Amino acid sequence: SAPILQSLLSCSRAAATDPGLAAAELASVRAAATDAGDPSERLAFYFADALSRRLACGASDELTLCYKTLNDACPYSKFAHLTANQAILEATGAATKIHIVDFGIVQGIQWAALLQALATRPEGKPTRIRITGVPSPLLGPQPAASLAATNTRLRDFAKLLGVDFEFVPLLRPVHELNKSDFLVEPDEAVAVNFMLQLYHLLGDSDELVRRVLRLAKSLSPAVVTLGEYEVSLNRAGFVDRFANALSYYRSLFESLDVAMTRDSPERVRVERWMFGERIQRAVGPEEGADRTERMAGSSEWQTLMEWCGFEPVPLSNYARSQADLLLWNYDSKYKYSLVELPPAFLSLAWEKRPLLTVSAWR
Amino acid sequence: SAPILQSLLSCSRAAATDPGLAAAELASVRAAATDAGDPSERLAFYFADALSRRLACGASDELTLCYKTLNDACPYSKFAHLTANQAILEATGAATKIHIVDFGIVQGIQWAALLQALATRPEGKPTRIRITGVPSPLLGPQPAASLAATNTRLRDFAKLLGVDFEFVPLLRPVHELNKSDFLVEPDEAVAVNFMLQLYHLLGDSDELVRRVLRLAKSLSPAVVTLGEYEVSLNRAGFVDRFANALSYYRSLFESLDVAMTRDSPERVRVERWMFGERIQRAVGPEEGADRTERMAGSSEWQTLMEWCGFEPVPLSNYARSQADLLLWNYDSKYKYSLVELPPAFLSLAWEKRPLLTVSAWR
């Protein structure tokens, strides 16, 4: 472990104690840190900033560009989508009519991939596919242009498969939606998809994540797919959260380093506006009900899903191969691998540290 | 059309006439050209160089790196592989044992993709898949380390699918191989794959391309897939070849420009060692039997395939959708589209100009 990061960790520990943290210690880390240097230097830059802000207190455009950059450089979103899609395909094989509910849609590519897969599945192409999409916070407060374009794009794609298809959005806040808003029909199989979405609802209270998991369960889904960041940033106390976050973001920062140049502006946008802001939320001033954008590890998610009446579904026999296929062209300098977490999670890891975990439930 | 390119074209025309080309004209193009400027400037640089060499006469490492760069920046190889694989999957559905013959294998990714697809096909997973691979010239005169590693990688992948699998290489020159060398068995379906390979055999004479197409036919394949550069650089005379090549490479150079930075060293490697060398071969000094690395348009390929007793096979109903899916994340600055060429070719185009064409035959 790099000295700048060990010094940062001792800073967080000192900060949480009675004597407190000396300015010289934090100043030394801040001096050594750089948002333009190597991954450990950049990482310390954003963490030392957040720690400063914590001590001092006592956009939509950025994010959408960031999301696109991250997914061109890294296999995270593709891993998650394809692994979720394989679980949906297998769960819904006996159905001729399928209804997908996407809590937190960004662009349409997961569903374009799924449509292609459904068209060629063993049981034969479905006679109807409907998608109901709740826009991801990544699309901002003004998601209409983006959703309409995704709708058009998916409907044009479905025409090229010869399949009856519909897409509709739900724009009201999820906390106001009810079962009847999803317009589910008795003759269709439902799959519910939560990809990098549900962590937004974690809070001092579980009520919002409970309300939407109950809502999902009420649709009697054939399967519910969950894709989540693998880091425990919820109820743990500050010193543990700081350590958990530092290790997690160290892996993310390193995977950016192998993928993009040291001077890439796109890279800095991701590091500052996506990762840096998340770091501020996890390790910055805010606490209790004020602390937002929490994340949880896979055991905590399992506890919540089972609490809401779901049970684990094993992933496909062909989920590890599909994920290896996706990683095939990442040469030797990349450090991606797949890690199983119990009971039925599959996670994409960097240097054997799980970063993005996918699971299926019913 | 850019003035530097129109000036280049008039240069080629002057060169082929009796008066000849004036040094001032070619010097003006050479002055304006730059291997570090915009696509039309880089293009003129390599073409003006080749034209100079023509007038004056009266590696494996480079290429392998180039191939990797090109395929990380552009969808050409993925388009070709996935479209070929879909045709193989459909042709071999009724078979429980499949034997793939790959003339010109580079790395294993086409077959890893096909194995994944076969494992999930409607008819149920095959009981045995064998692959016989002839190494691509891109692997150089020393392909053993690369082939062995590909073999290992594909066999490890097949274990994760639960399918009986074998891979073997053929290292002798293709002009010495015979039907018995492929060890085909009466109970298996054979697919033969030529992806960016057969153009290497085109020559003043057709004998080498004839010999290998007859060899393929003798294996009684369920399907033969062909993927080729869409540019007529074979029997056409110099002024036509120069014009054809200039238009073709203009599209390739432009697609690199949207994908990579102007100062990328990787980009220059591709432009100089892959494209620049090909340009030298097409438009440089060599003629008649000395002219090598010819390329042909889709009509010429159809003539040759039919001459060798093959007939066109329609591509999948889901080949256009699969190709749209592959292109989904190329944003608006990219100019890729799909173009049908008769009778049954599918081509990936840049600004509506076909660049890489795939077809199936039997």
UniProtKB/Swiss-Prot annotation, chains A, B:
Residues 149-181 are annotated as: Leucine repeat II (LRII). Residues 67-133 are annotated as: VHIID. Keywords: DNA-binding, Nucleus, Stress response, Transcription, Transcription regulation. Residues 284-362 are annotated as: SAW. Residues 2-58 are annotated as: Leucine repeat I (LRI). It is found in: Nucleus. A motif (LXXLL motif) lies at residues 198-202. One of its GO terms (molecular function) is DNA-binding transcription factor activity. Its main location: nucleus. GO terms for biological process: regulation of DNA-templated transcription. GO terms for cellular component: nucleus. Changing K333 to A/E: Loss of DNA-binding. Residues 1-362 form the GRAS domain. A motif (VHIID) lies at residues 98-102. Residues 190-281 are annotated as: PFYRE. The GRAS domain is involved in DNA-binding. Homodimer. Probable transcription factor involved in plant development. Involved in environmental abiotic stress resistance. May increase the expression of stress-responsive genes. Binds DNA in vitro. Belongs to the GRAS family. This is SCARECROW-LIKE protein 7. The gene is SCL7.
